[PDB]
Amino acid sequence: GLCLAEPHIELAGGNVHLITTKERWDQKLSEASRDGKIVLANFSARWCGPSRQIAPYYIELSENYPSLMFLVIDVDELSDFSASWEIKATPTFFFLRDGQQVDKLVGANKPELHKKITAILDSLPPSDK
């Protein structure tokens, strides 16, 4: 499920990077671009059950799949930024190469998030593997 667009729990454990400045977004996307990495960007809200639901799995996946750069954006901290990204629901996952969409998942679905991660890494060119 999802919430249409606050207990103290971790959204940014493991290898997940918290994004609550616009510059960190640009810093991380620029790093991923320089390093030829896909970015997984999780736009979440701490008050949203489903965002919290997927959180520990997202964190575990960040440790299983270090080839991908895992971000979490708190939509209530970067609200103007999230609006510009047309976030309608949380959690929304964008898979981004150089900041453009290569895949997308909306909602807290563990099996499909995992499938999308493996598929996207499989389709990397030999130069990027």
Side-chain angles (χ1 to χ4, degrees):
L2 56 78
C3 314
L4 286 170
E6 166 162 314
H8 295 196
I9 61 87
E10 293 197 303
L11 299 185
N15 294 328
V16 181
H17 302 276
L18 181 68
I19 305 297
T20 62
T21 64
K22 278 187 198 213
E23 73 198 64
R24 273 174 63 76
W25 176 259
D26 278 317
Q27 176 191 320
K28 298 306 287 183
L29 265 64
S30 63
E31 176 189 346
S33 184
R34 295 192 313 269
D35 294 350
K37 288 187 173 180
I38 303 163
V39 169
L40 182 40
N42 172 179
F43 287 83
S44 270
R46 295 177 184 276
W47 50 262
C48 176
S51 284
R52 301 197 306 274
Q53 183 187 321
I54 197 83
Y57 189 54
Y58 190 64
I59 291 164
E60 174 65 14
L61 285 172
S62 81
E63 297 191 323
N64 299 162
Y65 291 100
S67 301
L68 286 183
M69 177 181 285
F70 286 61
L71 310 182
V72 66
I73 298 91
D74 184 335
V75 297
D76 286 323
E77 301 295 311
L78 290 180
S79 39
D80 294 308
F81 175 65
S82 300
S84 78
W85 273 71
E86 156 202 309
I87 303 303
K88 286 170 88 182
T90 56
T92 293
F93 301 89
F94 283 95
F95 290 79
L96 303 168
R97 184 85 193 253
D98 298 274
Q100 55 85 37
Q101 181 178 324
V102 297
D103 206 345
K104 187 183 178 180
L105 192 173
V106 182
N109 194 280
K110 307 191 182 187
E112 197 78 8
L113 178 64
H114 193 194
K115 287 190 173 80
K116 291 182 183 289
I117 288 168
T118 65
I120 212 73
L121 293 168
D122 175 82
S123 74
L124 287 162
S127 59
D128 281 321
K129 282 184 172 192

